[PDB]
Write an enzyme that holds these catalytic residues in place. Structure first.
Site, PDB file in Angstrom:
ATOM      1  N   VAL A  59       0.862  -1.167   0.000  1.00 31.38           N
ATOM      2  CA  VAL A  59       0.000   0.000   0.000  1.00 31.38           C
ATOM      3  C   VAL A  59       0.900   1.219   0.000  1.00 31.38           C
ATOM      4  CG1 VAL A  59      -1.853   1.247   1.117  1.00 31.38           C
ATOM      5  CG2 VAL A  59      -1.762  -1.268   1.196  1.00 31.38           C
ATOM      6  N   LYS A  66      -6.700   6.874  -2.069  1.00 35.78           N
ATOM      7  CA  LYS A  66      -7.993   6.308  -2.505  1.00 35.78           C
ATOM      8  C   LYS A  66      -8.789   5.860  -1.276  1.00 35.78           C
ATOM      9  N   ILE A 100     -11.536 -14.044 -24.725  1.00 37.26           N
ATOM     10  CA  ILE A 100     -11.526 -12.610 -24.975  1.00 37.26           C
ATOM     11  C   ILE A 100     -10.690 -11.978 -23.871  1.00 37.26           C
ATOM     12  CG2 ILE A 100     -12.875 -10.487 -25.164  1.00 37.26           C
ATOM     13  CD1 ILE A 100     -15.187 -12.100 -26.108  1.00 37.26           C
TER      14      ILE A 100
HETATM   15 NA    NA Z   1     -11.465 -13.523 -21.108  1.00 43.99          NA
END
Ligand code: NA
Ligand code: A1ACD
Ligand code: MN
Ligand code: MN
EC number: 2.7.7.7
Length: 323
Positions: A59, A66, A100
């Site tokens: 960290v 954030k 994908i």
């Molecule tokens: Na994928």
DNA sequence: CCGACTCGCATCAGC
DNA sequence: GCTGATGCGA
DNA sequence: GTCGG
């Protein structure tokens, strides 16, 4: 702070991680966010400030800030914006189809292909892998209960034995560590005909047999040593599941079993301590390091424990290899 | 300041 | 045709 | 992104 602790934080980091990988094509930022989420998920307190979190390993200043914003306001402007963005949101979503990745998802979204419908309308633009990931999109996001895993093991070990009594097959992965739930089935496979100095034809025969009895239903990728495919318990129909089969030389088998059993975290811890003791371990061998750091010849391994011994470590049963 | 942070297989770019 | 690069999931 | 060299 109910789901574990810092659940809102770990989800935040995981989402940020996902967009880095899928939209930004930044694997290292992705790994940084996931590591940070993993450290925080283990931290046994509810975090009350970015400064507190900053003292955790992994960290740094940016994730600390954030967290302060998340804690001060209940949300992260950057994530809300990313969340609502048509293009980032659609790119991120499409990578959930197996086959994908970020690159294909970006090209698809560029030409207006943004949803499962869009993909189903455009099957011609999908390679074979992507077609199967689309076909089993929902199935592949289901976890596998251990009891189905055992039924699946029953089938794999039986059919392998039927091909050749000399095969050795071990289901590794989270199954072997005793997980009540698994994302896929990992099967390691070896034979006395296949050593590091030896037509393998040993993987194809097992794959073929598992197809004959209609356990394996589709092939994502198959070579002489690695098979990635889809399988299904016989019946209301069970979901189609992911199965990886790896054929490894007999003389590197226990190195593989250890590598493909243990959690990623555990593998890392063992690689570290192995260096500490002058050993380099990969998935196939353990080697000693010379005085300069050069690697020697692989050392004999006749048991997973032999590896623990080499590096002077108390045997850790697979059930206890989460880290 | 700045670069660091594995492998087997499928497909595609290009020769 | 082939080789190498890029993509992918692990 | 974080963290060393
Ligand atoms: Na994928
Ligand atoms: C991806 C990956 C894998 N490995 C080893 C260890 C891992 O345990 C085994 C099986 O890998 P995986 O099937 O992808 C997840 P798993 O542990 O089986 O848990 P689930 O699949 O049930 O979610 O391969 C690494 O050392 N480093 C890695 O980066
Ligand atoms: Mn697994
Ligand atoms: Mn796997």
């Amino acid at each position: 702070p109910q789901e574990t602790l810092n659940g809102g934080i770990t989800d935040m980091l995981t989402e940020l991680a996902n967009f880095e990988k899928n939209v930004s094509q930044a694997i290292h930022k992705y790994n940084a966010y996931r590591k940070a989420a993993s450290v925080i998920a283990k931290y046994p307190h509810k975090i009350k400030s970015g400064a507190e979190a900053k003292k955790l390993p992994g960290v740094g200043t940016k994730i600390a800030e954030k967290i302060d914003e998340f804690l001060a306001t209940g949300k992260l402007r950057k994530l809300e914006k990313i969340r609502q963005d048509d293009t980032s949101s659609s790119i991120n979503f499409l990578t959930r189809v197996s086959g994908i990745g970020p690159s294909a998802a970006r090209k698809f979204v560029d030409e207006g292909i943004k949803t499962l419908e869009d993909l189903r309308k455009n099957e011609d633009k999908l390679n074979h892998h992507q077609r199967i990931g689309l076909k089993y999109f929902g199935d592949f996001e289901k976890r596998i209960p251990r009891e189905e895993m055992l039924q699946m093991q029953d089938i794999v070990l039986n059919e392998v034995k039927k091909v050749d009594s000399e095969y050795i097959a071990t289901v590794c992965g989270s199954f072997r560590r005793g997980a009540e739930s698994s994302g896929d089935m990992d099967v390691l496979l070896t034979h006395p005909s296949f050593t590091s100095e030896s037509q393998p034809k040993l993987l194809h025969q097992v794959v073929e047999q598992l197809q004959k009895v209609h356990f394996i239903t589709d092939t994502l990728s198959k070579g002489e040593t690695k098979f990635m495919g889809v399988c299904q318990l016989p019946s209301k129909e069970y979901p189609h599941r992911r199965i990886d089969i790896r054929l490894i030389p007999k003389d590197q088998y226990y190195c593989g079993v250890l590598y493909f059993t243990g959690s990623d975290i555990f593998n890392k811890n063992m690689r570290a301590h192995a260096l500490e003791k002058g050993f380099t371990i990969n998935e196939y061998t353990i080697r000693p390091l010379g005085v300069t750091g050069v690697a020697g010849e692989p050392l004999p391994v006749d048991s997973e424990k032999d590896i623990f011994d080499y590096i002077q470590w108390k045997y850790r049963e697979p059930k206890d290899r989460s880290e």
